[PDB]
């Protein structure tokens, strides 16, 4: 409690005590630093601290303390400026202007305290946003005048103008009202003519680079908005593209300026603009070739060395070249005197594309896509870039990433496919060459053979079938030879995987050569017995990948075969999968299900299904008989695991067969639900005998896995079913009886959220056919689940998300279920929706807002009937004020758009006279008062109490505009945004809400 002296405003502020706290915070450590931090926050947040800011800026020797003082002052200017006496406003302006003038005079201070000076400049800009130009018309003229008196003042004026341009044009959208932004934008547009003169004079005459760089940094900001004539009707492009590219001080910023110049809005039909656009590109590439590095330089090595700012420069050069060439390269393609410039620019990009830097590669790759796509469709262009595209092929091939990164592979594939169409012969030659260097060992490595295999596999479908046949054969032959050459399981495993990857990428080839396809599959089966790490996973993943694309060739009887190959697979299935892990067996069965679904003869399809499921059905029948005999047998971990793996197998086959799976589901369905009940009892019994901790034990977790996989199986089939009559008449009745009461009557920690998910799917697809079933679902899960999740936002996250998904679908498909709720339960329904508004969890928030929206629509559809009338009397203003609450509290910004839409709907109901009854109590306002008048009256009172620092005029204007605009969502949203700005300050202009006329 020693440093806490400054927090006492009774006595004068002891500057020396302040500088100790500040120094202890920035330069100190540990407890003393932490205690200093809390004291500084409490001092800074004192609503009177700004008054003691003038003291600090004058009599403090610590620049950190002055910085903090300006921060306190900044909070004041931003939020309470208009509330002050006009005396203070003029005073604060005066000693901010003066403080900046003095700091620019002391060259010692001007160079040592750049931070403090930039902070003071920003504080000045905040005052400008409040006062300029209506109460400060002479700022710009006096700024230009003062510039000529001191180089230090002139430089700092460039910093002030930079920050002003940023605050008005770059960061105003969400920090000001639309009207105030437009006001400041127009104000700068008016007085930019003279701003530019000062800037152009400095650039042409000035010598000190610190002033040059600061002027160029402000120019960068101007280019975001200024008219193009200031750039093309002056000599400024000449200065940027020549003078300022030679010195490394100005080079970085100049390059960024020219990048933005390449984005200006220019005529497009003037031929002198095109000359100037060509000219500054020509000058820039010239300066680079002579002053930085030639086009032959190894930029990969330069970037890796990371000397000085080379990395940032090469990044900015990539951005400049790609930006300009994406927009203007046509200007260079027709004139033969511009051909060398065109190809040198692209050769720099080739060199840039070899840098080992993922994010930079993505930038250049995006441009290459832009190029090769244009060469694919635009006539008479590709011959120009023959040598560029040839180099590009090698660059893409050598930097190919793993496909499983996923986004970068797709981008690389797309470019390489285009490049293959442009010259298939050159692509083939590069790949065979690369492969020869893998065989002769000159470039051999696990990484290099993988990269090449991915590249070869990425272009399938681009060659003719005959060329592809010859190419594929050559590749596999070579890869097979490479594998025999290598020794050791590790090497032979890498090459074997790459062999299998390539074949999996060429299904057109496999579909035309059954003999070969058969050999591949049988070889994969051999790999399913190999235990070397990764082999079995590779074999299974290649199996299903090939099947997904060649399934038709497994279901037919191929010539010179006695049976469709699928039958052969199912025969040896036990032997084939004997060495696989369960998850790998399930993939295998899923792959078989893919094939079986290609058989459209029902009798044969069902027979294949029976044969495929033979082993799991026999294991199933056995344990079903053992389970019913000795229920304690389910306490055996091995039995639980066997059961779960049987069900997972059914899920796998059901996932790939969908509606065709129904006959297998019928074989197990009734005994599966009995099993569901039996494991349910055991879970409940374990929790009773050991407590809630039992839910964490492996025993119980194994039991709940059975329940969850049963629900997943049922969910999977119903989601894909075609015969919904059978779903309703056969599946739903037993399912609800098996799951609902169990869920309702378990303690919260034993309830499976998957029950909610499964029910959501039932309602989605057959909800309209089982209204009494939907009612039963709500009764069993609604109140008990709501009580689990309406105490905080953290507990039971899975139940939380599934809960609102379930309510959403019921509100869409069986709204009548909510009309049957007793009034007390319907009130909880409303409470639950609003409760969802207040979640930051997007999953919950988004559904809560959609339910509210669909609920209003449902009520509206009912017309003028008692339930709708009673709904508005009870809950209309609850939804209006709850929507307004999350809209204005700054903790639910992620849902602004859906909050705005819901609010617009609520307001539109009243101003369309869709609410037939009065929303007020007849003693509250004179009879005959319209709901319009009352709604505006209710909202005015609500906002006046929630935001008491607003004037009645602000509130009245905001509501008049919001009401008039409830048919124009974009404008409506703008008015809400303007309101969100005004509530953060005092004295907001009520006329701002007329911005949209």
């Amino acid at each position: 409690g020693s440093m806490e002296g400054i927090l006492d405003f009774s006595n004068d502020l002891d500057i020396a005590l302040l500088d100790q706290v500040v120094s202890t915070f920035y330069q100190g450590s540990g407890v003393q630093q932490k205690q200093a931090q809390e004291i500084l926050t409490k001092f800074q947040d004192n609503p009177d601290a700004w008054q003691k800011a003038d003291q600090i800026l004058q009599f403090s020797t610590n620049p950190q303390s002055k910085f903090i003082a300006l921060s306190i002052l900044d909070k004041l200017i931003t939020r309470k400026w208009k509330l002050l006496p006009n005396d203070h406003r003029i005073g604060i302006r005066n000693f901010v202007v003066g403080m900046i003038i003095s700091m620019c005079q002391d060259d010692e201070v001007f160079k040592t305290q750049k931070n403090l000076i930039n902070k003071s400049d920003l504080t000045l800009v905040q005052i400008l946003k409040q006062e300029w130009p209506q109460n400060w018309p002479e700022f710009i003229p006096e700024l230009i005048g003062s510039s000529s008196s001191s180089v230090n003042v002139c430089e700092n004026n460039m910093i002030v103008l930079k920050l002003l341009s940023e605050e008005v044009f770059d960061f105003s959208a969400e920090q000001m009202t639309q009207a105030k932004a437009l006001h400041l934008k127009n104000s700068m547009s008016k007085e930019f003519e003279q701003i530019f003169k000062l800037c152009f004079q400095v650039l042409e005459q000035g010598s000190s680079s610190s002033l040059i760089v600061a002027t160029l940094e402000s120019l960068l900001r101007y280019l975001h908005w200024i008219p193009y004539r200031y750039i093309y009707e002056t000599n400024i492009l000449e200065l940027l593209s020549t003078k300022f590219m030679t010195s490394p001080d100005t080079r970085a910023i100049t390059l960024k300026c020219l990048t933005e110049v390449s984005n200006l809005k220019i005529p497009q039909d003037n031929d002198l603009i095109k000359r100037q656009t060509v000219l500054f590109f020509q000058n820039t590439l010239q300066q680079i070739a002579t002053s930085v590095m030639p086009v032959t330089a190894d930029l990969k090595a330069t970037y890796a060395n990371a000397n000085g700012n080379d990395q940032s420069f090469l990044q900015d050069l990539a951005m400049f070249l790609t930006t300009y060439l994406a927009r203007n390269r046509a200007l260079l393609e027709s004139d033969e005197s511009l051909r060398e410039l065109l190809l040198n620019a692209h050769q720099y990009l080739i060199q840039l594309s070899k840098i080992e830097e993922r994010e930079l590669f993505k930038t250049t790759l995006d441009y290459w896509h832009n190029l090769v796509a244009d060469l694919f469709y635009e006539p008479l262009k590709k011959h120009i870039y023959e040598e560029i595209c040839s180099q590009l092929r090698l660059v893409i091939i050598e930097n190919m990433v793993r496909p499983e990164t996923i986004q970068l592979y797709k981008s690389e594939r797309e470019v390489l496919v285009y490049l293959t169409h442009l010259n298939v012969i050159d692509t083939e030659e590069i790949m065979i060459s690369k492969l020869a260097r893998q065989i002769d060992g000159s470039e051999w490595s696990w990484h290099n053979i993988n990269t090449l295999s991915w590249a070869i596999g990425s272009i399938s479908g681009t060659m003719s079938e005959d060329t592809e046949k010859r190419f594929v054969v050559t590749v596999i032959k070579d890869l097979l030879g490479l594998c025999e050459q290598k020794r050791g399981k590790d090497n032979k495993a890498v090459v074997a995987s790459d062999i299998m990857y390539v074949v999996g990428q060429y299904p057109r080839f496999l579909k035309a050569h059954w003999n070969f396809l058969r050999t591949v599959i049988l070889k994969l089966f051999e790999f399913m017995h190999e235990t070397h790490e990764g082999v079995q996973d590779m074999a299974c993943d290649t199996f299903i990948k090939i099947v997904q694309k060649c399934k038709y060739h497994f279901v037919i009887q191929q010539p010179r075969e006695s049976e469709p190959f699928i039958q052969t697979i199912i025969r040896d299935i036990q032997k084939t999968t004997a060495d696989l892990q369960p998850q790998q067996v399930h993939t295998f069965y899923k792959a078989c299900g893919i094939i079986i679904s290609e058989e459209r003869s029902v009798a044969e399809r069902n027979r294949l299904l029976s044969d495929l499921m033979q082993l799991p059905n026999m294991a199933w029948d056995t344990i079903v008989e053992q389970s019913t005999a000795n229920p304690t047998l389910l306490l055996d971990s091995e039995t639980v695991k066997i059961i779960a793996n049987i069900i997972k197998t059914n899920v796998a086959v059901c996932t790939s067969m969908g509606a065709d799976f129904y006959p297998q589901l019928g074989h197990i369905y009734y005994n599966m639900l009995q099993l569901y009940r039996a494991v349910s009892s055991m879970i409940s019994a374990q929790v009773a005998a050991e407590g809630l901790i039992a839910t964490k034990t492996p025993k119980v977790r194994g039991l709940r896995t059975i329940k969850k996989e049963i629900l997943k199986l049922v969910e999977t089939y119903i989601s894909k079913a075609r015969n919904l009559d059978d779903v309703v008449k056969v599946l739903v009745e037993p399912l609800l009886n098996a799951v609902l009461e169990d869920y309702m009557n378990n303690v919260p920690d034993a309830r499976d959220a998957e029950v909610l998910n499964c029910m959501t799917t039932v309602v989605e697809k057959v909800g309209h056919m089982i209204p009494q079933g939907v009612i039963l679902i709500l009764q069993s899960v609604f109140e008990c689940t709501l009580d689990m999740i309406n105490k905080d936002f953290t507990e039971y996250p899975e139940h939380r998300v599934e809960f609102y998904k379930l309510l959403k679908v019921i509100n869409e498909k069986s709204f009548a279920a909510f009309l049957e709720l007793p009034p007390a339960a319907f009130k909880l329904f409303v409470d639950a929706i609003c409760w969802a508004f207040k979640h930051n969890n997007r999953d919950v928030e988004v559904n809560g807002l959609q339910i509210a929206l669909d609920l209003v629509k449902n009520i509206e559809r009912m017309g003028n009937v008692p339930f709708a009338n009673e709904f508005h009397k009870n809950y209309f203003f609850i939804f209006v004020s709850e929507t307004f609450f999350v809209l204005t509290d700054s903790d639910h910004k992620s849902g602004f758009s859906k909050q705005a839409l819901l609010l617009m709907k609520l307001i539109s109901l009243v101003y369309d006279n869709k609410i037939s009854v009065p929303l007020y109590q007849e003693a509250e306002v004179p009879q005959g008062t319209s709901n319009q008048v009352y709604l505006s009256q209710y909202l005015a009172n609500m906002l006046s109490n929630a935001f008491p620092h607003l004037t009645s005029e602000q509130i009245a204007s905001f509501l008049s505009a919001l009401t008039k605009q409830c048919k124009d969502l974009v404008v409506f949203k703008g008015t809400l945004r303007d309101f969100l700005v005004q509530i953060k300050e005092v004295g907001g202009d009520p006329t701002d809400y007329l911005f949209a006329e």
Binding site: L480, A496, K523, E530
Partner: peptide
């Protein structure tokens, strides 16, 4: 060369030796 291919592919050792 198609029969060559399946021949060489069959020789790919399932046990990686």
């Amino acid at each position: 060369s198609l029969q060559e291919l399946v021949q060489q592919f069959e020789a790919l050792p399932g046990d990686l030796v």
